[PDB]
């Protein structure tokens, strides 16, 4: 599995966020607020050769 090529990308998806938050431990609110995020992945190709 010899390394074909490494590469990286940078894309952004407004993720999912449905979280509940307590005010003062008596009552809680669910503050759904989807947030921006630039995710990145490093694509490492590994050419397979006999």
């Amino acid at each position: 599995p010899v390394h074909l090529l490494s590469q990286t990308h940078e894309e952004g998806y407004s993720r999912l966020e449905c979280k509940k938050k307590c005010t003062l431990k008596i009552f809680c609110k669910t503050v759904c607020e989807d947030v921006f995020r630039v995710a990145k992945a490093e694509f490492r190709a590994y050419w397979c050769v006999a």
Binding site: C18, T23, F27, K29, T30, V31, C32
Partner: protein, 50 residues
Amino acid sequence: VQEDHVRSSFLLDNQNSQNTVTASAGIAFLNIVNFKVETDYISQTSLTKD
């Protein structure tokens, strides 16, 4: 020989919560003839999902 199926599905949600917290003061006849304190606080949360 002919046939057909239809299968509708409709699921709706809602969580319409609310809060209202108020405080007050008014210690005023002696050593300070007047000073008044009151805070207000109202929070809402309405989340529908269909």
